[PDB]
């Protein structure tokens, strides 16, 4: 109802600058459902957590953008954060 965009922002601003840089790199290769776009490498370069939250909600939606963000956090080893993201959407 708007809750999942908030959860994406809360998760991404929780990350260190290093972890955001690795998250954004992981976005280039993370498996996507059919028909959804991939964010170009150049577009990610200038993006803070605010900017990334908007981009993720505009490529994917609120609902799928959160599921994908949780997938990437799991592949980075940050299991605790991925749990609080998945918990907040439902």
């Amino acid at each position: 109802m708007g809750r999942a965009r908030d959860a994406i922002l809360d998760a991404l601003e929780n990350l260190t600058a290093e972890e955001l840089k690795k998250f954004k790199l992981k976005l280039l290769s993370v498996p996507l459902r059919e028909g959804y776009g991939r964010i170009p490498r150049g577009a990610l370069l200038s993006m803070d957590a605010l900017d990334l939250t908007d981009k993720l909600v505009s490529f994917y939606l609120e609902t799928y953008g959160a599921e994908l963000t949780a997938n990437v956090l799991r592949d980075m080893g940050l299991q605790e954060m991925a749990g609080q993201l998945q918990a907040a959407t439902h």
Binding site: D6, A7, D10, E13, N14, T16, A43, S46, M81, A88
Partner: protein, 265 residues
């Protein structure tokens, strides 16, 4: 700052939600369970998102916390953090802080990154950041700031990211960025700036990205000519909300014309 008898979690942490957080961190069954100071000492990171926390009273007892992430709670006061000298990452976005007690950050000399994004700060204390010599990340965006105290950033020599976007800044102090020679990323978008002082960005020799859009730039106001010359010389630095190079994104109010267009370069 210590507990001398094993104590129920609920007693040390009056906030019911924060006590739940402490119990999960320590992996106990109930908040009624008894905890020792040795067990409290094992906690070095806390993550409590969207947990309806009002107070972190009792966090004074957790002297080893380095990573503190409490976004989207209802915090009005962070006094209880004054003595957590092991803090190195402090993210308090989407809370309801309206003021920082004077000297609240003077003891947090290990802080790398600080985010006060989406709070309600109407002003900053003088010298509030002077002790955070190792700070690299400072997000103050989406507050209610009316001005910046002079020299507020003068001590933050390692800062690489500074976000002042979405406030109500009407002016910037002379030389307010002159010590930030390592800054790569400066966000000033969505403020009430009519102009900036001459050469305000002149000493930022590491700047890679700047956001200047959604400010009421006055094409006649003093210092706009320097800003126009600066933009013309550093056009690739200037970004729009989509993230793209857009040196024209900074717009003269009223006419709507690019600040860049004022001079021909």
């Amino acid at each position: 700052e210590t507990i001398t008898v094993s104590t129920p979690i609920k007693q040390i942490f009056p906030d019911d939600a924060f006590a739940e957080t402490i119990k999960a961190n320590l992996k106990k069954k109930s908040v009624t369970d008894a905890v020792t100071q040795n067990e409290l000492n094992s906690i070095d990171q806390i993550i409590a998102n969207n947990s309806d926390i009002k107070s972190v009273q009792g966090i004074q007892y957790l002297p080893n916390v380095r990573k503190l992430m409490l976004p989207r709670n209802k915090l009005h006061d962070i006094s209880a953090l004054k003595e957590l000298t092991n803090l190195t990452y402090l993210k308090l976005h989407n809370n309801q802080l309206q003021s920082l007690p004077n000297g609240v950050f003077d003891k947090l000399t290990n802080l790398k990154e600080l985010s006060l994004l989406f709070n309600q700060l109407q002003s900053l204390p003088d010298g509030v950041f002077d002790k955070l010599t190792n700070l690299t990340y400072l997000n103050l965006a989406h507050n209610q700031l009316q001005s910046l105290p002079d020299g507020v950033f003068d001590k933050l020599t390692n800062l690489t990211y500074l976000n002042l976007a979405h406030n109500q800044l009407q002016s910037l102090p002379e030389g307010v960025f002159d010590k930030l020679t390592q800054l790569k990323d400066l966000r000033l978008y969505q403020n009430q700036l009519k102009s900036v002082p001459d050469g305000v960005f002149d000493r930022l020799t590491s700047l890679q990205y700047i956001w200047l859009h959604d400010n009421p730039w006055d094409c006649t106001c003093p210092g706009i000519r320097n800003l126009s010359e600066w933009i013309n010389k550093h056009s690739g630095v200037v970004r729009n909300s989509a993230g793209s190079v857009a040196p024209d994104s900074a717009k003269c109010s009223g006419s709507g014309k690019p600040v860049r267009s004022i001079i021909c370069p």
